[PDB]
Amino acid sequence: LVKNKCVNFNFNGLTGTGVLTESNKKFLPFQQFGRDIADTTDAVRDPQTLEILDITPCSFGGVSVITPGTNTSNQVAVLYQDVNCTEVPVAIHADQ
Amino acid sequence: LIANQFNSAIGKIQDSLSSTPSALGKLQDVVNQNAQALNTLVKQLSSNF
């Protein structure tokens, strides 16, 4: 089990994707999954350790490029919408 | 007299806004419409189609 890192988790064939964190939600014994409004799995019970983990997806957002005219200049600035600056992708991750 | 009337009218606006909860009906209605549209859009992911 890997927590606090975005992983391609496969809980009993759920084959989801997201970052796993410890959850304080108390699952009833007969239920092993937790959905939400969009009917996407939110919390799962570990089949081995029998602990409840929250599935929140990886940090995602839009990319806005602040540029003057190409005839004016060439430098650009990049805006990562609703993303904290502490987030640092060392490897290639989607845009750029 | 006119200054007192103006001050009393402003105070009455203060009181009416503070007491009546449905005073800001239009803005709350706009917010509710947008939130309901977003909630319906989210809930549409649960249908099989």
């Binding site: 969009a38 997806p57 995602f60 919408q81 | 803005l27 709350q28 917010v31 859009l41």
Partner: peptide, 25 residues
């Protein structure tokens, strides 16, 4: 008049004019 944790591609862009700037106007 009365942040949502919507992760299905939905985001709320902040207004350009903050409430402080609107109050300053």
């Amino acid at each position: 008049v009365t942040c949502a944790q919507k992760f299905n591609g939905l985001t709320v862009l902040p207004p350009l004019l903050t409430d402080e700037m609107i109050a300053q106007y």
